[PDB]
Design a protein around this ligand. Sequence first.
Ligand SMILES: CCCCCCCCCCCCO[C@@H]1O[C@H](CO)[C@@H](O[C@H]2O[C@H](CO)[C@@H](O)[C@H](O)[C@H]2O)[C@H](O)[C@H]1O
Ligand SMILES: CCCCCCCCCCCCO[C@@H]1O[C@H](CO)[C@@H](O[C@H]2O[C@H](CO)[C@@H](O)[C@H](O)[C@H]2O)[C@H](O)[C@H]1O
Ligand SMILES: CCCCCCCCCCCCO[C@@H]1O[C@H](CO)[C@@H](O[C@H]2O[C@H](CO)[C@@H](O)[C@H](O)[C@H]2O)[C@H](O)[C@H]1O
Ligand SMILES: *C/C=C(C)/C=C/C=C(C)/C=C/C1=C(C)CCCC1(C)C
Length: 274
Amino acid sequence: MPSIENFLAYDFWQYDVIRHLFAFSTAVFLAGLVYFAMTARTTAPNYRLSANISAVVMVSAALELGQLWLLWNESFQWAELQGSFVPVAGERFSNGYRYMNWLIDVPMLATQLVVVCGFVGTELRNRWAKLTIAGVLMILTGYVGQYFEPAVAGVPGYEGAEQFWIWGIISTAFFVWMLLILANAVRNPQGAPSDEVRSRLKFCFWFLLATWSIYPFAYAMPLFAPTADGVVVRQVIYTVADVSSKLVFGVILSQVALRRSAEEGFEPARVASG
Ligand SMILES: CCCCCCCCCCCCO[C@@H]1O[C@H](CO)[C@@H](O[C@H]2O[C@H](CO)[C@@H](O)[C@H](O)[C@H]2O)[C@H](O)[C@H]1O
Ligand SMILES: CCCCCCCCCCCCO[C@@H]1O[C@H](CO)[C@@H](O[C@H]2O[C@H](CO)[C@@H](O)[C@H](O)[C@H]2O)[C@H](O)[C@H]1O
Ligand SMILES: CCCCCCCCCCCCO[C@@H]1O[C@H](CO)[C@@H](O[C@H]2O[C@H](CO)[C@@H](O)[C@H](O)[C@H]2O)[C@H](O)[C@H]1O
Ligand SMILES: *C/C=C(C)/C=C/C=C(C)/C=C/C1=C(C)CCCC1(C)C
């Protein structure tokens, strides 16, 4: 079944805002990529994998929010007689472009925190092989329950609203579990860090927990408000949870990594940062 976007008529502002936020978190992911590729030579070689990953999750999200921008632009056309952007009769818009490119981001947003915490070799690969299982078994489960939007929302003719709940609870069951490996790789850092860079990991973890709980709120939105200004609101909180969980989180992590690479002894990070 299509999304709940194609069953509604969007006014001028209700459509312009949504395409504007699709262009905004692409002009920002094509700027974060250039920033993360320009000051990736500052972190020490030990924690430069965390800066390379940060440059990967920006190129792998620019094509995620720019291929959805095109899909949003060609799916809807203005209709002056009505006064709204009615859906076109040939193309159907689906937000599932996000959940297919969340397979490159959900793993490589905790793999770059397990790296910053100081985990090397087997201790990092084993903890990556669990997060990359918890992140492709939670997103591939929330991606099955995404297809029952018009059924949970109440569109007449569409049935199967129970699957929206069923395939949504077996996604927060892995989202909670992934936090249990992210909070045992952050409460136990390696390399004997100082008490101030040990309290910044226990901030980068809460900044990852508090931006990953906006996605359960922005999917279950057709349950609550399946309207034009419940789609406008849901593409606001999937961008305030995008530019603040792939960009702000990466920049915050690039400072706690620079603090380790300025107390271990690296000079290009000890001169350019404290
Ligand atoms: C939109 C693309 C991304 C834009 C990100 C903008 C970040 C700057 C916003 C203000 C943050 C204030 O905090 C400031 O952060 C910058 C960047 O992390 C740090 O800057 C330090 O680390 C960065 C990243 O390795 C180096 O390029 C820089 O030479 C160095 O000074 C400062 O030491 C810190 O004081
Ligand atoms: C879309 C591609 C994204 C690629 C991101 C890959 C990250 C996932 C790695 C999982 C764990 C494997 O084990 C870990 O691998 C990384 C990368 O190979 C190694 O990392 C090492 O090699 C890489 C590549 O030469 C260097 O950039 C890095 O500075 C260095 O530490 C670690 O020493 C190892 O402990
Ligand atoms: C829209 C344009 C693109 C985005 C540009 C903006 C990016 C900004 C990134 C930098 C954010 C500021 O950097 C982050 O600030 C918070 C402020 O509470 C600091 O956190 C600080 O306060 C907390 C809360 O008391 C303490 O637990 C922590 O020890 C302390 O360092 C983080 O250690 C630092 O990493
Ligand atoms: C940049 C990519 C990010 C931050 C990915 C975040 C992913 C999630 C938090 C997904 C979790 C989900 C649930 C907890 C319930 C079902 C819906 C999901 C799949 C969006």
